């Protein structure tokens with residue numbers, strides 16, 4: 001009833017483990033991620049994450065189903081989700097500049113999705129706290145209304161507050177190196193504490209906020225698109241290269257001088273700095289960040 005009735009139309013590209021396609025399901029556009037049989041573990045883990053109780057949120061990618069498709073020779077392992085025509089936040093920020101209102105929209109919805117991810121919800125159909133672990137602009141999508149939704153949950157960790165355990169045994173350093181928190185880079189992260197994974201998501205989100213803010217154009221003035229640490233490391237940096245910059249030299253992305261001329265940019269810059277603390281225990285929470293950008297948004 002699902003993979004049976006879906007026609008693939010266009011190749012999007014390979015992920016860590018999957019190949020992504022644009023497909024058609026009942027005349028509607030969907031995204032389809034296809035794995036070989038030897039990638040059964042990645043496919044299953046990812047399907048498990050996206051089928052978490054109470055996960056659905058406007059700012060989290062809309063999961064449709066997991067399925068199998070036998071073509072006659074081999075079996076494909078399918079995941080299916082909503083299609084988003086604008087693509088990644090990364091793509092978006094390269095194409096366009098944003099207004100003040102538009103900057104706040106992208107940062108607020110991102111913060112809102114992450115806060116929902118991080119929030120343990122109680123009750124019968126309770127939702128466990130989840131940490132993403134590969135948060136970045138390429139793993140966030142922009143919807144038709146100009147709001148973000150978070151994607152690429154396959155590396156996430158879920159926390160059972162009952163037994164105080166995480167649902168997988170985490171091998172260290174899984175995400176994108178450029179966006180790794182200092183405690184991840186120098187290998188001092190305490191992984192017996194689930195809050196540690198939340199604090200590393202926040203550091204990465206700060207970097208994403210910086211990527212957004214650069215493209216906020218006020219009166220014609222803006223910076224062009226760069227990734228964080230574009231000025232400090234090569235395109236595919238190693239962990240040792242990041243560690244020397246982030247941990248040893250203790251550098252962060254530069255806050256432009258002009259961001260003091262506007263209140264929105266001044267608040268966003270303040271937020272970034274409180275995501276970038278070398279000490280994860282003193283960083284803002286996604287919920288705290290959500291509240292601040294909410295109050296900012298109504299001015």
Ligand SMILES: Fc1ccc(Cl)cc1-c1cc(Nc2ccnc3cn(CC4CCNCC4)nc23)ccn1
Pocket residue numbers: 012013015020021031032033046050063079080081082083084085086087088091141151152
């Ligand atoms: F496919 C899935 C099925 C199921 C599940 Cl659980 C996850 C995924 C999934 C999709 C991902 N990518 C995308 C989802 C929605 N709409 C998109 C539009 N594009 C265009 C690209 C052009 C080149 N630059 C990037 C953007 N990509 C999209 C990403 C991760 N997982």
